[PDB]
Structure formats: structure tokens, C-alpha cells
Ligand binder design. Sequence first.
Ligand SMILES: [Ca+2]
Ligand SMILES: [Ca+2]
Ligand SMILES: [Ca+2]
Ligand SMILES: [Ca+2]
Ligand SMILES: [Ca+2]
Ligand SMILES: [Ca+2]
Ligand SMILES: [Ca+2]
Ligand SMILES: [Ca+2]
Lengths: 385, 385
Amino acid sequence: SSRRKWNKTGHAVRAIGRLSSLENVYIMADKQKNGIKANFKIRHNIEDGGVQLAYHYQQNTPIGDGPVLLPDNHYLSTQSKLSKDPNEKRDHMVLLEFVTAAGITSKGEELFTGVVPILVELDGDVNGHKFSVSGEGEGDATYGKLTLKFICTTGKLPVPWPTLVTTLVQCFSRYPDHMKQHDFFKSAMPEGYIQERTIFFKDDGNYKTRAEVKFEGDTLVNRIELKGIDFKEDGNILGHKLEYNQLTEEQIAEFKEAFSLFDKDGDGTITTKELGTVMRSLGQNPTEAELQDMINEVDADGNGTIDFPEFLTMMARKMSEEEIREAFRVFDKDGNGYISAAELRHVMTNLGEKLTDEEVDEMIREADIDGDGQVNYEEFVQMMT
Amino acid sequence: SSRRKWNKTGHAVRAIGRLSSLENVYIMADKQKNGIKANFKIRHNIEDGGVQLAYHYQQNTPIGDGPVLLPDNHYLSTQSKLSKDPNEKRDHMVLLEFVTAAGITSKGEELFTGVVPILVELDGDVNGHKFSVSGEGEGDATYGKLTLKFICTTGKLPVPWPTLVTTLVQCFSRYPDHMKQHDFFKSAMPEGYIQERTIFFKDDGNYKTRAEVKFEGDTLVNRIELKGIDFKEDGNILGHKLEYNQLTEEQIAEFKEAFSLFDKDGDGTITTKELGTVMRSLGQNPTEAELQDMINEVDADGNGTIDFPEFLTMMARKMSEEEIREAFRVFDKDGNGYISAAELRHVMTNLGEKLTDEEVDEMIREADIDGDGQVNYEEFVQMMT
Ligand SMILES: [Ca+2]
Ligand SMILES: [Ca+2]
Ligand SMILES: [Ca+2]
Ligand SMILES: [Ca+2]
Ligand SMILES: [Ca+2]
Ligand SMILES: [Ca+2]
Ligand SMILES: [Ca+2]
Ligand SMILES: [Ca+2]
């Protein structure tokens, strides 16, 4: 009677919470300033329990005088990952970011065709506490990939690293082909733009930032000015009560090259064409609708193809070994229970991989436990665990 | 070196497997017969390990002579659930199904406005083994809901129940507002239609079915003829090697009424309007883009709104208690650590629920452990576990 009333009621309020994921920078155009505006919120997890909310308000403006692409309403989707360098004695932060544009159904772009070296210099002052951060890294707009390492050059960071994340280069965001006309950030380079932000930390102080994002050579640079005020000495920020920390770096790299098998033209995505091409090489034959449905299945944002992040979130999961036996069937074409150096070579070739004969044998040897020169099921399984 | 080669290679072939979910009846129009055609595959899990594949080929035709809606290419998405009645000594099967139409971006419809009583009669013969099945239940096209109990009237079922599932009423499928012009199944009633199928069980025999789906009164009836041949005595079908069995029935009902809180016009879906309306009652205020993004987040099929199945797959998950503390904040409006009968009444009312004062007090009493007439956090938590 009442137990059910609590249940149904709880499930409803909880459902809202599960729907209230995201996470998303909403971009709007601002004609008055030949630029864009944006706003979003960040949930910083608190060590012990709770969530520190930070409301962001963002305004961008071209530094140069040239023409600029003013976008229609859309949003940026981003994944962050913080970690530490075991060998670093300085107060530092390692960061991995994947930004992708969505929300829709030029010259400064060729600047972001390959890997671009990044430099970030931060000068901030929170409650009279002066500090400085500097970060080196690189960006890959093709995957919306972003990897940098920041170091505090003033000693100990007065605030939690997570709070500075949003402040420490949206020009590396990954814009889909059908939205490359809404990419304000790249159409502003090399001259670059100005990024201003007010960040309100609920029940605490606020940040005010002004940054210059431009090209100082072949290097993309981010010079930032920050000012924090009204922060409580016992608050989550000055009190360092927010959690800092999920895969391994090298771990993710594995999925990177796996992804590169499908993405054969290195444009950073997997189309239904590239997908079908691969499955067909592996002796499978999906229809056009199936291909589309497969992609649409993991393409949550709805851009069109399959992004590296999507590939990533899919491959991370766990549960259901059936996929392994299924993977074994793919290798074992004749289906007799063993994987031969030939069949293994055949799979490699199909996937479009250039492995020698010493290298293939090396792979066999790495899994061939009984030494029969083959790879049976019980070894294929253990080899993948 | 080689360890990485195995990894990357494995992740790729496994990725295909993870993408190869679904599951989907692809419907095409057939003008030559004022009807539709379809084809799809079913993976029957094998007890011990493996997957029995069944390729379906389907052809539909109107029984009557009236006008018929011929649909454009689209698909049906379906969830099945088998279970047993502890009190049933006869060979039986309990079935819960959720069918929804998708793939796109009349008179016989009003027949499926409420709950419609279903009757199914099956007459089959596999490898000379004659049997009969009959099932009673009801359908709710509003949710694409389908619930029936089948009983073998010939004694012991010669084949696994799972294999007969697809054979044992796509007129209860849930068609989105923008696709109600592609609903062939309902536009055929009351006269109904004929459903023919050939089902190929890889490495085994095949079924041939012919069924009449029409209205025999207010009851929707499915009279089926089945014939199985070429099945191996030691195969998965005649050998009964396929697994039979995930939530509880009553369990799911809880989510049903929770869903009914959002779905306030009982059309079977949750629009951005209905969602925002609820969150606003609970003192929250999302923008239009956020609402859309929230729905688009769990609307995998891409119909538009939020279906009961989607609501279901979302609420089932597990992991991360944070949602509970968050749910507590929703109840505790003043935020002092306790939930009062008033605040509890306030939440009920907001969600659009008509609870008395004896009933609300009953809820408090069901969670008020220390007896202070309130509900603190440690009790709110334990109350939801
Ligand atoms: Ca590509
Ligand atoms: Ca995408
Ligand atoms: Ca072999
Ligand atoms: Ca071996
Ligand atoms: Ca509704
Ligand atoms: Ca939907
Ligand atoms: Ca209170
Ligand atoms: Ca209490």
C-alpha cells in the first residue's frame, strides 16, 4: 500500500535524475559582436558525497577583423579525464578531452588538419591568492581529441584542479561535415578570439575569466586571466573537498587503433560505408538499413557517423562472454575449433592490416599454449583476459 | 608487440559484435498484394553456450476488400520476456512483449484505443509431431504492450517455447503519431489479415506458418497453422537445448505507474512538454534544448518522445547512490535534513497525485524509524533499498 507509494514516487524522481545527465555547452550566435555566446553547468563530485554545481556563462569575440562564421543553435558534447604523472613532484594535472559538436540535424579549418601543438598560460587570483598554471600538449580536431599536462608554477594550487578544467580551447572541437558552417572557433583562426566567462559556484564564490586563443606560430596558444571572489574559507573550493578522479591511457590507445581499422580515411568517423566494408571482408553481409540502425544505435548525439568517443563508451561496459565465442567464430573461418596462422593472416588482411609472417607467427606463439601451432578456443579466450 | 596486435584486433571484431545488437523486423510494402512484407533474424540463446539463429521471412495480406495503408520502409522494435506460473502443472508459457514502430524521421485504429482481449490458437506439426497451443491475454497498442499466457493442450510441447514466440499479433505494435499512416496492421481490422512465414533455423529444420489475425467480436484472434520439417533429432530444437530465461511482473508495474506520472494524457509517451511540466512542479527549470536533449538521450529508436520500454530500460541499470541523495533533496524543499508530512504531500501533489492525509501519514510511518514524525536521510535511503 504505502510501500508501493514510496516506490512509484521514488522511481519517478530518480528517473528525472537519470534523465538529467549531460553535460553540454549550448552555443548561440551573437550578431552584436560578430561572435557567439554560450552557457552550461558543471557538476563537480564532492569527496565524501554531494555535487558542487558551477554555472558557466560564456562570450566569444573575434580578435581579427576578417569574416566569421556565425553558427545556429547547437551544443558541444565533451568527455574529460584527469590523472597524475607518477614522476611529477610539482602540483600538476594530466588531462584527456574529447569534444564533439551536435544539435543540428572554411579557411581557418585547414589549420586544424593534423596534430596541433598547444600552449596554455594561466594567471589567476582567488581570494587574494595569486597562482600560475602552464600546460603543454596537442590537439586533434579530427577526433576532437585534446591531451595536455598542466603544472602549477607558483607552488601549490590554491583551488582544485577540476574547477580550472573548463577555464584551461574549443577550436579543437569536432564539427560534423554538415555543421562545418557553424564552427565559429576555427573560422576565427589564426588571429583567434577572446573567451570571457563568469562561473558561479553555488553557495560559494565565482570565477571571472578572460582568455586569448590564437596562433602564435604553428602553436595554438591560450593565455588566460582569472579572478575568483566570495569564496568561503570552509567551502568546497578553498577547502579542497572535491574529488580528483575511467580507463588507462595506453588502454585507450588500443581502442584508437581498433577504431582506425574502421576509419580507413582517417577523417575521425565511421560511416555506414566503412562499417559495411569491414563486416563484408569478415564474411558478413548486412543490409543498408541494418548498417544505419547499428550506427544510430550508438550515435546518441545524432551527428551521423560513429565518433571515437562513441566507439570508446561502447567498448567500455562489461557484463556475456558470448561475444568472445562469437569473435572466435570470426577468426575460425572453416569452423573446426582452431585458429591457424593462415586464418589469422586472413583476418589481418581483411581488416586491412599489413602483418608479416614472422609477426603473425609471433601472435600465434603468444597464444599457442599447447604448442600445436594453432589457437583453440580455450586459448583464444584466455588470450583475451 | 604481439599482445597489442591481439588486443587491437580483438577489440575490433568484438566491437562489430556489440554493434550487431538488434533485433528488428524490417517492414516493406508489397503492392502486388495490397499488403506488406518483412524479414528479420532471431538469436536464440543455447543452454551451455552458443546462439541458435532463426531467419524469418514474412508476408502479409488483407482478408477483407476495403482500403489499406501501405507503409514506407520502417521497422518494428520489440522486447520479449518469458516466465512461468508456479501454479501451472500444464506445459505453459507466460509472455510479456513491448512492440514499437520506428525507422521514419485511420478507421481500424480506434479498435485499439483501450485494452483489447486476445485469443491465440495454434495447430502445429514438427517432424510428424502434432501439438496444439492456446493463449489468453490482452494487448495495449498505446504502449505496444502485449501480455499473454499460452498452454499446450496436447500435453508436452515437442519444441522449445522460445521458437514459437514469433509465431504466437503485430497490430498491437505502437506506431508514433508521425507514422500512423504506415500502420498496415491496424488499417486491416476488423476483417484482419493473413500472416505467412518461413523460418529457417540454421543447421536445422524450418517452420512454415499461416495465421489469420482478425476480430471475432471485441476479441482479437490469432489462428495459426504451423509445419516444421528437416529438424534433427539431436538438434537444438527437437533436443530442447535452448534457454528459456529480467525483472518481476509486479516490479515492472511500479515503473508503469511511475511512467504514468509523466504521461498525463495516457497516450503512451512522454513529450518534452510533459517532462518540463513535471520538473517545473518539482521546482526545477530546464530550457527547451535541455528537455529535447534529455529525451533524445534515451530515445534510441528515434521516434520522438519517451516510450514505456525506454523508460523501462533506463530505470533498469544499476551501478552511484548519488541519485538517492539527489532524490532526497527533491523531497526536502527547505533542505533541513528531514522530510515532513507537508513536504511529502507537496511532492505528491506536484507529481499530480491524489493522496489523502491518512495515506500520507501512512507513508511517513512506513519510513519513520525513530518515530519523530519525519523522514531523515538515513531512513530515506534505507526506505529505497
Ligand atoms: Ca571515415
Ligand atoms: Ca556521432
Ligand atoms: Ca581452423
Ligand atoms: Ca594451440
Ligand atoms: Ca503523452
Ligand atoms: Ca521513442
Ligand atoms: Ca524539512
Ligand atoms: Ca524519522
